[PDB]
Design a protein around this ligand. Structure first.
Ligand SMILES: *[C@@H]1O[C@H](CO)[C@@H](O[C@@H]2O[C@H](CO)[C@@H](O[C@@H]3O[C@H](CO[C@H]4O[C@H](CO)[C@@H](O)[C@H](O)[C@@H]4O)[C@@H](O)[C@H](O)[C@@H]3O)[C@H](O)[C@H]2NC(C)=O)[C@H](O)[C@H]1NC(C)=O
Ligand SMILES: *[C@@H]1O[C@H](CO)[C@@H](O[C@@H]2O[C@H](CO)[C@@H](O)[C@H](O)[C@H]2NC(C)=O)[C@H](O)[C@H]1NC(C)=O
Ligand SMILES: *[C@@H]1O[C@H](CO)[C@@H](O)[C@H](O)[C@H]1NC(C)=O
Lengths: 49, 49
């Protein structure tokens, strides 16, 4: 389970088109002038109520 | 001495004989080494000489 909100004063929320992601990876020895060091990703989309 | 690959990727040549006894001859080509990402990394383009 994972969730994301948005407030500012007196907890009054604001509506918006959120675009959250959850990229994940293994070890970090492929970045020594080597592109795509950051492994495969995951993404989502939707509107805030 | 450099040269360029003729049709069917190939190069013939000769050299002068005036030394000691055992003569070592190596031939390098496109990308003489693997300097970017080496020593620390775990996967690379190990091309033969
Ligand atoms: C592969 O090896 C080649 C030879 O080592 C490299 O090619 C270049 O070849 C020239 C000529 O052999 C060398 O000399 C230069 O020449 C120019 C122009 O001079 C010309 O005119 C005189 C007239 O008397 C003639 O006798 C010459 O032979 C020339 O045809 C000069 O303006 C330069 O200052 C220079 O002296 C180059 O030095 C040589 N290049 C290198 C890097 O040694 C070829 O570049 C090599 N391949 C790679 C990828 O590096
Ligand atoms: C959080 O995720 C779980 C599923 O992984 C949802 O379901 C609950 O699962 C547990 C299992 O032990 C039950 O005890 C709960 O009763 C289940 N929930 C309900 C509403 O009955 C859970 O609902 C998720 N919570 C949110 C806020 O999305
Ligand atoms: C190449 O071999 C010839 C043989 O006639 C010799 O005269 C010349 O000095 C040699 N040159 C080099 C650079 O080895």
């Amino acid at each position: 389970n994972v969730s994301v909100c948005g407030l500012y004063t007196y907890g009054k929320p604001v509506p918006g088109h959120v675009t959250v992601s959850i990229c994940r990876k293994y070890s970090d020895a492929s970045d020594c002038h080597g592109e795509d060091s950051q492994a495969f990703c995951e993404k989502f989309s939707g509107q805030l109520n | 001495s450099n040269a360029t690959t003729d049709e069917h990727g190939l190069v013939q040549f000769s050299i002068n004989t005036t030394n000691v006894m055992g003569t070592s001859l190596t031939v390098r080509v496109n990308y003489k080494d693997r300097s970017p990402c080496y020593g620390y990394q775990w996967v690379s383009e190990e091309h033969e000489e």
